[PDB]
């Protein structure tokens, strides 16, 4: 079982740190949701949860995978397939996007 | 390090499963936030994150603690202190409220 948390927080335009939604994170969340179901293997072992700010906004979109404890930053919708394949199915975090383990 | 996720999802009244917010979970979230921000031994090591539905709504309010992977249900605001003391600090999940590990 893996639990994927995607920050979907939006902020008003003057917020210094911006927001993950402004940086494309709702499209990230959507891309995870489109995968996790059109894939039987993902669907029965993976949960995708939208969240408010996880306090790393300037490095967003922020995606966290538990129980592994892998924090990703700068995630694009185009990166969701690699995270699904390599990490959620393969067990190997996508090193280039990691901001914390 | 502990990461607490509190479902704060609301739903319209016809939704069969209801919602964590209708079951008091925004007050649960607020209680966790107040506690962590005012406890010198948690404020540097604990994150409290609000979420959308985590697919256990009839057991709400749903609270999940990672990386432990402890799922709580039926959490009242009045139970937050016990979870903070016994689990977040003490390392012993509040057995009575656990719905999954
Ligand atoms: S808005 Fe996403 S981590 Fe702050
Ligand atoms: S509304 Fe909270 S788990 Fe579904």
From Swiss-Prot, chains A, B:
- Binding-site positions, [2Fe-2S] cluster: 7, 20, 53, 57
Cofactors, names only: [2Fe-2S] cluster
Fetch the InterPro entries from UniProt.
Answer: Thioredoxin-like_sf
Keywords, A to Z, come to:
2Fe-2S, Electron transport, Iron, Iron-sulfur, Metal-binding, Transport
Cross-referenced Pfam families: 2Fe-2S_thioredx
Q: Where does the source fall among the domains of life?
A: Bacteria
UniProt-recorded Gene Ontology molecular function terms: 2 iron, 2 sulfur cluster binding; metal ion binding
Note on how the cofactor is bound: Binds 1 [2Fe-2S] cluster.
Look up keyword S-adenosyl-L-methionine and say if it applies. Answer: no
Signal peptide bounds: none
Transmembrane region positions? none
**Subunit notes for this chain?**
Homodimer in solution.
Q: Which family does it belong to?
A: Belongs to the 2Fe2S Shethna-type ferredoxin family.
Protein task: Ferredoxins are iron-sulfur proteins that transfer electrons in a wide variety of metabolic reactions.
* Protein name per its UniProtKB record: Ferredoxin, 2Fe-2S
Q: What is the lineage of its organism?
A: Bacteria, Pseudomonadati, Aquificota, Aquificia, Aquificales
């Amino acid at each position: 079982f893996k639990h994927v948390f995607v920050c979907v927080q939006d902020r008003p335009p003057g917020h210094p740190q911006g927001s993950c939604a402004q940086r494309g994170s709702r499209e990230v969340f959507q891309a995870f949701m489109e995968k996790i179901q059109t894939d039987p293997q993902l669907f029965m072992t993976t949960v995708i949860t939208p969240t408010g700010c996880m306090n790393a906004s300037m490095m967003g979109p922020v995606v966290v995978v538990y129980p592994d404890g892998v924090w990703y930053g700068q995630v694009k919708p185009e990166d969701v397939d690699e995270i699904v394949e390599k990490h959620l199915k393969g067990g190997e975090p996508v090193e280039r996007l990691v901001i914390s383990k």
